[PDB]
Amino acid sequence: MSLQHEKVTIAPLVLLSALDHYERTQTKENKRCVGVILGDANSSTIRVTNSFALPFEEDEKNSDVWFLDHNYIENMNEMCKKINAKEKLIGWYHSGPKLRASDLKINELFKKYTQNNPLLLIVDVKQQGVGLPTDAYVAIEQVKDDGTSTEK
Amino acid sequence: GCWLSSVDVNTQKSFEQLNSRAVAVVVDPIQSVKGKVVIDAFRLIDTGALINNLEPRQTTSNTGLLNKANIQALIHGLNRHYYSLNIDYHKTAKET
Amino acid sequence: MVLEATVLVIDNSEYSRNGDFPRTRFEAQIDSVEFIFQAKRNSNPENTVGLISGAGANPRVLSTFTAEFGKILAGLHDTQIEGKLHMATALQIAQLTLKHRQNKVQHQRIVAFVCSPISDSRDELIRLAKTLKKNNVAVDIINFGEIEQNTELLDEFIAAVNNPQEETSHLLTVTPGPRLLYENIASSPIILEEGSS
Amino acid sequence: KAQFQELDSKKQRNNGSKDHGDGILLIDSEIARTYLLKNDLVKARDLLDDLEKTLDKKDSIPLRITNSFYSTNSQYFKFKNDFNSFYYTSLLYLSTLEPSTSITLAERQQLAYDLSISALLGDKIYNFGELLHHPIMETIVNDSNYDWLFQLLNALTVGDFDKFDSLIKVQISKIPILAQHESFLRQKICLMTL
Amino acid sequence: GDDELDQEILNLSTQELQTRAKLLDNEIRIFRSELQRLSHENNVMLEKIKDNKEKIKNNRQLPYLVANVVEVMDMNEIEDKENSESTTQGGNVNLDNTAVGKAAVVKTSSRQTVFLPMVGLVDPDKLKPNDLVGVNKDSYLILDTLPSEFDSRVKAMEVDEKPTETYSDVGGLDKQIEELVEAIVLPMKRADKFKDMGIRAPKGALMYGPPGTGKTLLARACAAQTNATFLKLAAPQLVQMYIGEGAKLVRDAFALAKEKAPTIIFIDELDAIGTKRFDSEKSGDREVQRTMLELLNQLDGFSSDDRVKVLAATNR
Amino acid sequence: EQEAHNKALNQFKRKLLEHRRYDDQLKQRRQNIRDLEKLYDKTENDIKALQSIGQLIGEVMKELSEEKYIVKASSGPRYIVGVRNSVDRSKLKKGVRVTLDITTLTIMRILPRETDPLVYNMTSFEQGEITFDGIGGLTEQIRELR
Ligand SMILES: Nc1ncnc2c1ncn2[C@@H]1O[C@H](COP(=O)(O)OP(=O)(O)OP(=O)(O)O)[C@@H](O)[C@H]1O
Ligand SMILES: [Mg+2]
C-alpha cells in the first residue's frame, strides 16, 4: 500500500475547490460533503493536485448509515487520467469541522478502490487555529496505551 | 502572445452560436509571470459590425478602457477578427 | 411490475456457509440475483435493481442502480461473511439508495434476504415501521434463516406497513432446507404483487 | 496444510464470497510452536522469519493471524531467556486478544507468572507500573505463588526499600531462580529510584 | 469427451444416474452465473480500450515531425520503491505516470537532440540505432515508427553494370587484370572454401596511378564476371544538400549492398572526402568520412568477407 | 437397441457433457479478460506520456552554486539553469551530461554519459593471453617491458 507518507502539501486550488463544493451541494449545518482527493502519492511528500465532489449522504442519528455512489468514482477516475497524468485517487477529504469517529468506518470501505492507504484529509470550511485549518491524517494500526485493544 | 489564429476563430464561432454571448479566455503561461499578464478575453466581432460601424458599442456602457499586455499582438486582431475588453478578478471573503 | 426500483438487501453471514442450497448458500444467492434481475426487465425494461449488504462490521453499498445484471454480481463477489444481519440499519441505507435514481417515477420497495436473526432490537424496528409507510416503501421479507432454528417477530412490521402503497408488503416463507432457494423466490410473488390507490 | 493448498484454488471463485488463503499462514505458526517445545528453537525461528515477511505485505489479514504469530515468538524468547524481548512481545499478544475462544483460563494465569519474572530481571524495563494497572496481574494476587510476586513488582514501582528487601530474603530460599540474581535485583531498585 | 462409459453403467444403474443427472444441473447453474460475472468484466474493459484509442487518434495522425534515432539508451527501469527513474519524485511505478522507464536519444530534423520519456505504443524493442521515426511536432515524444530513409540517387546508384567493358575490349593491361581476379572474382565464386579454410578475404583493394590507365573499365568488368550487385559512388555525387544529410546516404547505400550478395561497392576519385589534411574546413563532410569507415570495419567484421567486396580508386 | 433404459441413458450423456463444457468455458472467459488487459495498459500509458513532455540534453559548463548550474545545450545555446530537488547534486559535477526542461529550463534528471563505442569495447573484454614463448625473435623485448 504505502509506507511512505510524511507530509501532505496542498495547493490552494484544492482548498478552494473543497470549499466551493460544500456550498454547491447545499450541504451545511454539520452535514458532509465528501469528495475524492486526486494527485500524486506513494511518496514522502504527498501532493494533492486536484479534487472533485462525490455524491454523499449522512444521517447523524446513526452514523452506521451513509450513501456513497459506486458508479461515480470509476467514471471520474477515467476522465481524470486524461487531463493530467498526475491524477489518481490518493484518499478522500472530509469537510470537518472536527475528526468524528464515524470517519474510520468510511475509511475502511475506501481502502478497496485505492492503490495505496487512503488519506483522511480534513479541510475545515470555517477557518481555525493560529495554525492552518488544514490537517492531514493517514490510517495506520497500532496497540493502545492500556496494552489492550489494537485499534485502527 | 494572446491573439487568435484562423483555426481558433472556427472553434470560437460555434460557442457564439450555442450561447449568444460567450468569451474565449486565452492563457499564454510562459509569457505570464504575474499570473495575470498575457491572459485576455476575446470575443467574435461580426462582419456586419465592421461595415455599418456597430463595432464600438462595447466602449460605451462599460469603463471604456482596454489594458494591453501585448501591445503588438492585441492591436492586430483588434480590427481583424476580434474585439478585446479587459478582465477583472473576484472572490468572496471566505475564499480570500 | 412496471417502473420499479428495488434494493436488494443480501446478508452474508455465518449461517450462509451452510449448504442446504447447493454448494453453500453464497452460491445459491448468486443464482437468486439473475432470475430477479431478468424478471423485472421482462415487465418493464426500465427497471433497476440495486444492492446493499447487511453483512460485516458496517452495512455498506455494494452496487448502485444500473440497467446491467453484470455490474450487480460484480460487486457481490467480494462480500464479507463474518457479520450477521443488522435489520434496522439496512432499511435506513436502502431508503437513501432509492433516493438517488435517474427518474423518481420508479416504485420504492425493499426486499430483504434473512439468513441470520437480528443483531439489533425490537425497540428499533417499531420506529422503522412508522418511518417507512410515510415514504410508501414496502418491507418484503424472504425468510429462510430465522425459521431454521428460530422465530421471527417481523410479521408485526409487515402488516403495520401495508396500506394502499406503491408496492404492497407481504411475507414470503422459503423452507430453510433444500427446496432450491433460487426457484422459490422466482416462483413466489415479487411482481405478481402490485400496489393500489 | 496439503489439504488446504488443493482446496483453495477452485473454492475462491466457487463460493464467490469467501477466502481460504488465510488458513495457510496459521498452520505455519502451529508448526513453529511444536518445534519450540521439541527444543529445535532454530527450526521454528527461521520458519517464523519467512512467515513475518508475508504478514507485513498484507493489511487485510484477520486479528487471529497476528495473535498466533506473537504467541509463538514469545515462547522462542522464553526458551532463550531473553527477559526484555519476552516482555514486549507478550504485551503484543494482550492487545490482539479476541473475545473469541482462542484462550483458556490456564493461559491467563501462566502469562501473568512469566511476565512478572521477566520484568524483574529486565535490563531496561521500567514498565512495572504498566503491568500493575493491567488486568492480567490484577486478578491473581490472592494465591501463594503470585502473592510475593505482586508485592515485589509493587515495591519496585514505588522505589520503596523497606517492603522490597524484606521480600528478597524469602525468595532466595523459596525460588533458586532468584537466588543468583540477588545482586541484580538490589542494583535494579536503586537504578529506578535515582 | 466420452460420457457414460461402460464402467458407470455397471457401477450405478439407470435410476441412480437419474439422481446423478439432477445433482449435475444444480452445479451447472452455479458456474452459469460466473459466466455473467466474467462477460461483464470483459464488456466494460472493451469500452475502455476504444475510449483511449479515440484520444490517441488526434495526436497520432499526420502531420508530425521526422527525426532519427541516434541510439537507444535503454535507461533503467526500477531500482527504487517509487517511480522507475533513479531520481525520487512524487509519482509511482509505471511506464508513464510521472515515472519514466526506458528512454532513447533522438536527433530531430528541427536541429535538437531530445531525450524524452518513452510512449506506451512505441517501445525500445521496436527500435534499433539509425532508424527513422515520426516524432509528434508539438511535444517531442517518439509518436510512431517509419521505415528507414530511401533516396532517389541512392536507389539509382545500385545497378549500372551495363555498359560493360569486359577484358576482351580492354587491350592488355596485365599483370593487373590477373591481380584483379585474384583479389575479387576468385574468392567471390569459391566463397564456401574460404570459410572452411580459415584464411581472410582481402579487405577491399585500392587501384591507383595516373588517369587514363583504365581503372573505371576494369572495375565495371570485374562485376560482369561475378554477376554481382554493382553499386557505383563518386565523391562529388555522394555529397548532396546540407552536409549533415551526407552521412545518411553512405549508410543507405551499404544497407542495400550487403543484401543480395555478391556485391562490389566501388568508390571512385577520393580527393575531397578522404583528404589527408584536416586544415581544409569541413564539418559535415567529416561525418561522411567516418560513415565510410564503418563499411571497411564490417569487412574485418566477417573474418572472410567474400560476400562483400569493396574496390577504391583515386588519382593520387 | 429398443429398450427404455437406453432412452434414459442418452439424456444423461447431455447432462454430463454440459457439466464438463461449462468448465471448459470458464477457462475461456478468463482468457478473454487477460487479452484485453494488456492492450488496455499500452493505449493508456501513451496518453500519460504525452502529458510528460520531452526534454533537451546539455552538460555542465561550470558549477556556479549548489542548486543552480550553468550549462551548454546541444541546441547550440548556453543557459543558466536551476536544478530540481528530485535529482542529486552529487551526480552533478562539472562536465557531466544532463537533460533539462523546455518548459522551465531546469535540470530534471541525470542523463548518464554516453559511452563512446571504440574505447569501450576494449575496456569491457580482456584482450589476453599471449604466451612468452609463443612469440619468436621479439622474446628479449617482452622481458625488457616487464
Ligand atoms: N588500358 C586501356 N585499354 C583500353 N582503353 C583504354 C585503356 N586506358 C584507357 N583507355 C581508354 O581511355 C578512356 C578514358 O580512360 P578512363 O576513363 O578509363 O580512365 P581512369 O584511369 O579510369 O580515370 P579517373 O582517374 O579519372 O577515375 C577509356 O574509356 C578507354 O576508352
Ligand atoms: Mg576512372
Short mmCIF file of N, CA and C in Angstrom, two decimals, chain E residues 130-261:
data_model
loop_
_atom_site.label_atom_id
_atom_site.label_comp_id
_atom_site.label_asym_id
_atom_site.label_seq_id
_atom_site.Cartn_x
_atom_site.Cartn_y
_atom_site.Cartn_z
N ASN E 130 19.65 4.33 -35.65
CA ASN E 130 19.71 4.84 -37.02
C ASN E 130 18.53 4.62 -37.81
N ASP E 131 17.34 4.50 -37.08
CA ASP E 131 16.02 4.29 -37.59
C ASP E 131 15.37 5.61 -37.66
N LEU E 132 14.67 5.85 -38.78
CA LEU E 132 13.84 6.98 -38.95
C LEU E 132 12.51 6.78 -38.26
N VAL E 133 12.11 7.84 -37.55
CA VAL E 133 10.96 7.81 -36.65
C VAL E 133 10.23 9.15 -36.74
N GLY E 134 8.91 9.10 -36.65
CA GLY E 134 7.95 10.17 -36.51
C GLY E 134 7.93 10.51 -35.10
N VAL E 135 8.04 11.76 -34.87
CA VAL E 135 8.10 12.27 -33.51
C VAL E 135 6.95 13.30 -33.55
N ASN E 136 6.11 13.40 -32.46
CA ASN E 136 5.00 14.41 -32.55
C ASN E 136 5.64 15.80 -32.67
N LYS E 137 5.06 16.65 -33.56
CA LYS E 137 5.64 18.00 -33.94
C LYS E 137 5.67 18.93 -32.68
N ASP E 138 4.54 18.99 -31.92
CA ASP E 138 4.41 19.99 -30.88
C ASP E 138 5.20 19.64 -29.55
N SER E 139 5.12 18.45 -29.05
CA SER E 139 5.90 17.99 -27.90
C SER E 139 6.67 16.82 -28.40
N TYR E 140 7.86 16.68 -28.01
CA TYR E 140 8.83 15.80 -28.66
C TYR E 140 8.80 14.51 -27.92
N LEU E 141 8.14 13.47 -28.50
CA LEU E 141 7.99 12.08 -27.96
C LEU E 141 8.05 11.19 -29.21
N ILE E 142 8.62 9.92 -29.10
CA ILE E 142 8.54 9.07 -30.28
C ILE E 142 7.06 8.69 -30.46
N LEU E 143 6.38 9.03 -31.61
CA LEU E 143 4.91 9.03 -31.77
C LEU E 143 4.53 7.80 -32.58
N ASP E 144 5.30 7.56 -33.66
CA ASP E 144 5.14 6.40 -34.47
C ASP E 144 6.43 6.12 -35.22
N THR E 145 6.49 4.86 -35.72
CA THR E 145 7.64 4.34 -36.40
C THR E 145 7.56 4.64 -37.85
N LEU E 146 8.68 4.52 -38.54
CA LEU E 146 8.72 4.70 -40.03
C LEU E 146 9.82 3.76 -40.51
N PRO E 147 9.81 3.26 -41.72
CA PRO E 147 10.95 2.53 -42.26
C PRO E 147 12.09 3.46 -42.44
N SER E 148 13.24 2.84 -42.79
CA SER E 148 14.49 3.52 -42.98
C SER E 148 14.42 4.43 -44.19
N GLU E 149 15.17 5.64 -44.22
CA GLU E 149 15.21 6.52 -45.31
C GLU E 149 15.67 5.88 -46.63
N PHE E 150 15.13 6.32 -47.77
CA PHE E 150 15.41 5.89 -49.08
C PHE E 150 15.55 7.14 -49.88
N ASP E 151 16.48 7.21 -50.75
CA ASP E 151 16.68 8.45 -51.55
C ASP E 151 16.84 7.99 -53.00
N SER E 152 16.41 8.88 -53.91
CA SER E 152 16.26 8.71 -55.33
C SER E 152 17.61 8.42 -56.04
N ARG E 153 18.62 9.10 -55.63
CA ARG E 153 20.02 8.95 -56.07
C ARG E 153 20.64 7.70 -55.57
N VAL E 154 20.43 7.32 -54.27
CA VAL E 154 20.85 6.05 -53.67
C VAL E 154 20.31 4.89 -54.36
N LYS E 155 19.00 5.00 -54.75
CA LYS E 155 18.29 3.90 -55.47
C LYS E 155 18.76 3.65 -56.84
N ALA E 156 19.04 4.75 -57.51
CA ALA E 156 19.70 4.78 -58.81
C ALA E 156 21.05 4.17 -58.82
N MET E 157 21.92 4.41 -57.82
CA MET E 157 23.36 4.06 -57.79
C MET E 157 23.49 2.55 -57.92
N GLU E 158 22.55 1.76 -57.27
CA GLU E 158 22.60 0.32 -57.38
C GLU E 158 22.07 -0.02 -58.77
N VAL E 159 22.83 -0.92 -59.51
CA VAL E 159 22.69 -1.36 -60.90
C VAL E 159 23.05 -0.23 -61.91
N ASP E 160 24.16 -0.45 -62.61
CA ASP E 160 24.70 0.35 -63.71
C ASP E 160 25.86 -0.44 -64.34
N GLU E 161 25.85 -1.77 -64.27
CA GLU E 161 26.91 -2.58 -64.83
C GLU E 161 27.05 -2.66 -66.30
N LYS E 162 25.91 -2.36 -66.92
CA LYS E 162 25.79 -2.21 -68.36
C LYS E 162 25.75 -0.73 -68.57
N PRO E 163 26.59 -0.11 -69.40
CA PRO E 163 27.68 -0.57 -70.23
C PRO E 163 28.69 -1.41 -69.57
N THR E 164 29.10 -2.49 -70.28
CA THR E 164 30.07 -3.49 -69.83
C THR E 164 31.24 -3.42 -70.68
N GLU E 165 32.49 -3.47 -70.11
CA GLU E 165 33.72 -3.28 -70.83
C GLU E 165 34.47 -4.56 -70.94
N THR E 166 34.15 -5.62 -70.15
CA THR E 166 34.79 -6.91 -70.13
C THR E 166 36.32 -6.82 -70.03
N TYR E 167 37.11 -7.89 -70.52
CA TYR E 167 38.56 -7.85 -70.67
C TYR E 167 38.87 -8.18 -72.11
N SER E 168 37.93 -8.44 -73.05
CA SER E 168 38.20 -8.63 -74.49
C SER E 168 38.19 -7.36 -75.28
N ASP E 169 37.91 -6.21 -74.64
CA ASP E 169 37.75 -4.93 -75.32
C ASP E 169 38.60 -3.92 -74.53
N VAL E 170 39.49 -4.41 -73.68
CA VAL E 170 40.42 -3.61 -72.94
C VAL E 170 41.69 -4.31 -73.35
N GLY E 171 42.56 -3.59 -74.11
CA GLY E 171 43.76 -4.12 -74.72
C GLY E 171 44.82 -4.16 -73.70
N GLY E 172 45.21 -5.47 -73.34
CA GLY E 172 46.30 -5.79 -72.42
C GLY E 172 45.86 -5.29 -71.12
N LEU E 173 46.89 -4.97 -70.34
CA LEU E 173 46.85 -4.38 -69.03
C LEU E 173 47.27 -5.29 -67.92
N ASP E 174 47.92 -6.41 -68.31
CA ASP E 174 48.43 -7.38 -67.37
C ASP E 174 49.81 -6.90 -66.96
N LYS E 175 50.28 -7.19 -65.71
CA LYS E 175 49.93 -8.03 -64.62
C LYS E 175 48.51 -7.86 -64.07
N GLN E 176 47.99 -6.61 -64.03
CA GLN E 176 46.95 -6.04 -63.29
C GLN E 176 45.65 -6.68 -63.47
N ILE E 177 45.26 -7.17 -64.70
CA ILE E 177 43.97 -7.88 -64.90
C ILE E 177 43.96 -9.17 -64.13
N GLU E 178 45.08 -9.91 -64.08
CA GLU E 178 45.24 -11.14 -63.30
C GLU E 178 45.10 -10.90 -61.81
N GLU E 179 45.72 -9.81 -61.33
CA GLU E 179 45.78 -9.41 -59.94
C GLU E 179 44.38 -9.14 -59.44
N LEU E 180 43.58 -8.40 -60.29
CA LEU E 180 42.16 -8.09 -60.02
C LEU E 180 41.24 -9.31 -59.80
N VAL E 181 41.46 -10.36 -60.66
CA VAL E 181 40.79 -11.64 -60.46
C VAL E 181 41.07 -12.30 -59.14
N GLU E 182 42.38 -12.33 -58.73
CA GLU E 182 42.85 -12.98 -57.50
C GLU E 182 42.20 -12.31 -56.30
N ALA E 183 42.20 -10.97 -56.27
CA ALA E 183 41.61 -10.26 -55.17
C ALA E 183 40.11 -10.46 -55.00
N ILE E 184 39.41 -10.42 -56.12
CA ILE E 184 37.96 -10.17 -56.17
C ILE E 184 37.19 -11.38 -56.61
N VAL E 185 37.30 -11.71 -57.93
CA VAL E 185 36.48 -12.72 -58.63
C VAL E 185 36.64 -14.08 -58.11
N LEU E 186 37.89 -14.60 -57.91
CA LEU E 186 38.25 -15.91 -57.44
C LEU E 186 37.71 -16.15 -56.04
N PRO E 187 37.74 -15.32 -54.97
CA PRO E 187 37.11 -15.60 -53.68
C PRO E 187 35.62 -15.38 -53.72
N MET E 188 35.13 -14.53 -54.62
CA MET E 188 33.71 -14.38 -54.71
C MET E 188 32.89 -15.61 -55.09
N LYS E 189 33.47 -16.36 -56.07
CA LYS E 189 32.76 -17.51 -56.59
C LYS E 189 32.93 -18.83 -55.69
N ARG E 190 34.19 -19.02 -55.09
CA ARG E 190 34.55 -20.24 -54.36
C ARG E 190 34.40 -19.95 -52.88
N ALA E 191 33.37 -19.13 -52.45
CA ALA E 191 33.21 -18.45 -51.18
C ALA E 191 33.11 -19.42 -50.02
N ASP E 192 32.52 -20.63 -50.28
CA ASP E 192 32.29 -21.66 -49.31
C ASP E 192 33.63 -22.24 -48.74
N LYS E 193 34.68 -22.46 -49.64
CA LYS E 193 36.02 -22.94 -49.37
C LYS E 193 36.74 -21.99 -48.43
N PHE E 194 36.55 -20.67 -48.60
CA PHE E 194 37.25 -19.65 -47.93
C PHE E 194 36.83 -19.56 -46.44
N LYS E 195 35.59 -19.96 -46.07
CA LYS E 195 35.11 -20.07 -44.76
C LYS E 195 35.72 -21.27 -44.06
N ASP E 196 35.79 -22.39 -44.83
CA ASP E 196 36.18 -23.68 -44.33
C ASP E 196 37.68 -23.53 -43.95
N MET E 197 38.58 -22.91 -44.83
CA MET E 197 39.97 -22.93 -44.66
C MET E 197 40.41 -22.05 -43.52
N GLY E 198 39.75 -20.90 -43.37
CA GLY E 198 40.01 -20.02 -42.24
C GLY E 198 40.90 -18.85 -42.56
N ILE E 199 41.39 -18.74 -43.86
CA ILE E 199 42.17 -17.61 -44.36
C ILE E 199 41.22 -16.46 -44.47
N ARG E 200 41.69 -15.22 -44.38
CA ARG E 200 40.94 -13.99 -44.65
C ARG E 200 40.82 -13.81 -46.14
N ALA E 201 39.82 -13.00 -46.52
CA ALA E 201 39.44 -12.46 -47.78
C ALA E 201 40.11 -11.09 -47.75
N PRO E 202 40.66 -10.63 -48.85
CA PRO E 202 41.16 -9.30 -48.96
C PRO E 202 40.15 -8.19 -48.59
N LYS E 203 40.52 -7.17 -47.77
CA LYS E 203 39.64 -6.32 -47.03
C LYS E 203 39.30 -5.11 -47.79
N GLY E 204 39.24 -5.37 -49.12
CA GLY E 204 38.95 -4.37 -50.16
C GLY E 204 40.11 -4.33 -51.15
N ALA E 205 40.33 -3.31 -51.93
CA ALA E 205 41.58 -3.16 -52.70
C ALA E 205 41.68 -1.67 -53.07
N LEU E 206 42.90 -1.18 -53.43
CA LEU E 206 42.97 0.19 -53.87
C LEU E 206 43.58 0.12 -55.25
N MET E 207 43.10 0.75 -56.31
CA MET E 207 43.68 0.77 -57.62
C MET E 207 43.90 2.18 -57.80
N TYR E 208 45.14 2.50 -58.19
CA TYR E 208 45.63 3.89 -58.17
C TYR E 208 46.71 4.04 -59.21
N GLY E 209 47.10 5.29 -59.58
CA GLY E 209 48.03 5.59 -60.63
C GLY E 209 47.50 6.80 -61.45
N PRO E 210 48.26 7.43 -62.35
CA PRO E 210 47.77 8.39 -63.31
C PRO E 210 46.53 8.05 -64.06
N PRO E 211 45.61 8.98 -64.28
CA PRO E 211 44.34 8.74 -65.02
C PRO E 211 44.55 8.31 -66.47
N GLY E 212 43.53 7.58 -67.02
CA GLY E 212 43.62 7.04 -68.33
C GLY E 212 44.33 5.75 -68.29
N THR E 213 44.55 5.10 -67.17
CA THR E 213 45.16 3.74 -67.16
C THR E 213 44.09 2.73 -67.28
N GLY E 214 42.79 3.15 -67.07
CA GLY E 214 41.67 2.26 -67.42
C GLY E 214 41.18 1.51 -66.23
N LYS E 215 41.11 2.19 -65.03
CA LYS E 215 40.64 1.69 -63.73
C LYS E 215 39.14 1.49 -63.71
N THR E 216 38.42 2.34 -64.51
CA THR E 216 36.96 2.52 -64.36
C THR E 216 36.33 1.33 -65.01
N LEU E 217 36.56 1.13 -66.36
CA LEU E 217 36.73 -0.06 -67.19
C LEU E 217 36.90 -1.36 -66.45
N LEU E 218 38.07 -1.53 -65.71
CA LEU E 218 38.42 -2.80 -65.08
C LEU E 218 37.47 -3.14 -63.91
N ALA E 219 36.92 -2.15 -63.16
CA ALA E 219 36.02 -2.40 -62.02
C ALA E 219 34.67 -2.79 -62.43
N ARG E 220 34.21 -2.15 -63.59
CA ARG E 220 32.93 -2.48 -64.20
C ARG E 220 32.85 -3.89 -64.74
N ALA E 221 34.00 -4.23 -65.39
CA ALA E 221 34.23 -5.56 -65.95
C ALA E 221 34.25 -6.65 -64.85
N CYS E 222 34.83 -6.34 -63.72
CA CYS E 222 35.15 -7.25 -62.59
C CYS E 222 33.88 -7.86 -62.10
N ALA E 223 32.85 -7.06 -62.04
CA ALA E 223 31.42 -7.17 -61.71
C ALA E 223 30.53 -7.97 -62.71
N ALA E 224 30.85 -7.88 -64.01
CA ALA E 224 30.27 -8.63 -65.03
C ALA E 224 30.58 -10.07 -64.85
N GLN E 225 31.86 -10.38 -64.59
CA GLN E 225 32.27 -11.77 -64.38
C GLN E 225 31.57 -12.57 -63.30
N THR E 226 31.35 -11.89 -62.15
CA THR E 226 30.95 -12.44 -60.96
C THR E 226 29.46 -12.30 -60.86
N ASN E 227 28.83 -11.54 -61.84
CA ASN E 227 27.40 -11.30 -61.89
C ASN E 227 26.81 -10.77 -60.57
N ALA E 228 27.20 -9.57 -60.20
CA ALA E 228 27.02 -9.18 -58.85
C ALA E 228 26.35 -7.86 -58.82
N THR E 229 25.90 -7.44 -57.56
CA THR E 229 25.19 -6.26 -57.43
C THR E 229 26.20 -5.06 -57.37
N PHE E 230 26.25 -4.26 -58.44
CA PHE E 230 27.27 -3.32 -58.63
C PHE E 230 26.62 -1.99 -58.18
N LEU E 231 27.25 -1.37 -57.14
CA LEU E 231 26.94 -0.05 -56.74
C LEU E 231 28.14 0.84 -57.12
N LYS E 232 27.87 1.95 -57.81
CA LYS E 232 28.82 2.96 -58.13
C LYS E 232 28.56 4.25 -57.33
N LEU E 233 29.66 4.82 -56.75
CA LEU E 233 29.58 6.07 -55.99
C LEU E 233 30.72 6.93 -56.45
N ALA E 234 30.62 8.30 -56.34
CA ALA E 234 31.78 9.09 -56.79
C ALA E 234 31.69 10.18 -55.76
N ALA E 235 32.83 10.64 -55.24
CA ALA E 235 32.99 11.55 -54.14
C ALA E 235 32.23 12.88 -54.46
N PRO E 236 32.07 13.58 -55.55
CA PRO E 236 31.21 14.80 -55.52
C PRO E 236 29.74 14.40 -55.52
N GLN E 237 29.27 13.22 -56.12
CA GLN E 237 27.92 12.72 -56.21
C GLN E 237 27.40 12.44 -54.87
N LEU E 238 28.16 11.91 -53.91
CA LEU E 238 27.81 11.37 -52.62
C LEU E 238 27.31 12.39 -51.71
N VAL E 239 27.91 13.58 -51.77
CA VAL E 239 27.55 14.75 -51.05
C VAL E 239 26.44 15.41 -51.79
N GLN E 240 25.35 15.70 -51.07
CA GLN E 240 24.19 16.32 -51.66
C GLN E 240 23.62 17.18 -50.57
N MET E 241 22.96 18.32 -50.91
CA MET E 241 22.32 19.27 -49.98
C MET E 241 23.16 19.63 -48.76
N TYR E 242 22.49 19.83 -47.63
CA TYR E 242 23.15 20.05 -46.33
C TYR E 242 23.96 18.85 -46.03
N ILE E 243 25.16 19.06 -45.57
CA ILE E 243 26.31 18.23 -45.45
C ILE E 243 26.23 17.25 -44.30
N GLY E 244 25.28 17.57 -43.39
CA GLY E 244 24.75 16.69 -42.31
C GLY E 244 23.71 15.75 -42.74
N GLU E 245 23.28 15.78 -43.95
CA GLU E 245 22.43 14.80 -44.56
C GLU E 245 23.32 13.89 -45.46
N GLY E 246 24.68 14.11 -45.47
CA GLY E 246 25.59 13.43 -46.35
C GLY E 246 25.91 12.05 -45.81
N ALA E 247 25.78 11.96 -44.45
CA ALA E 247 26.10 10.78 -43.70
C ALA E 247 25.06 9.66 -43.80
N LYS E 248 23.76 9.99 -44.08
CA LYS E 248 22.68 9.06 -44.18
C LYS E 248 22.83 8.25 -45.42
N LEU E 249 23.35 8.92 -46.46
CA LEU E 249 23.49 8.39 -47.83
C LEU E 249 24.47 7.28 -47.95
N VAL E 250 25.58 7.23 -47.16
CA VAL E 250 26.65 6.29 -47.26
C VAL E 250 26.13 4.96 -46.79
N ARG E 251 25.30 5.05 -45.70
CA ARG E 251 24.72 4.04 -44.83
C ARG E 251 23.62 3.32 -45.50
N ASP E 252 22.80 4.15 -46.19
CA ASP E 252 21.71 3.72 -47.03
C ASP E 252 22.22 2.85 -48.13
N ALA E 253 23.37 3.20 -48.69
CA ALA E 253 23.95 2.58 -49.85
C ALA E 253 24.41 1.19 -49.50
N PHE E 254 25.06 1.10 -48.30
CA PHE E 254 25.63 -0.11 -47.81
C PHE E 254 24.63 -1.00 -47.22
N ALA E 255 23.40 -0.44 -46.86
CA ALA E 255 22.32 -1.27 -46.38
C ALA E 255 21.84 -2.14 -47.47
N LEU E 256 21.75 -1.57 -48.69
CA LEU E 256 21.28 -2.28 -49.85
C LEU E 256 22.21 -3.35 -50.31
N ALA E 257 23.52 -2.99 -50.35
CA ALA E 257 24.53 -3.72 -51.00
C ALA E 257 24.75 -5.12 -50.43
N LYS E 258 24.84 -5.19 -49.02
CA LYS E 258 25.23 -6.38 -48.32
C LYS E 258 24.15 -7.44 -48.54
N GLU E 259 22.94 -7.00 -48.54
CA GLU E 259 21.78 -7.78 -49.02
C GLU E 259 21.84 -7.90 -50.54
N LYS E 260 21.39 -9.08 -51.10
CA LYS E 260 21.55 -9.51 -52.43
C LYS E 260 23.00 -9.58 -52.71
N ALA E 261 23.76 -10.48 -52.06
CA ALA E 261 25.17 -10.63 -52.36
C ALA E 261 25.39 -11.66 -53.37
#
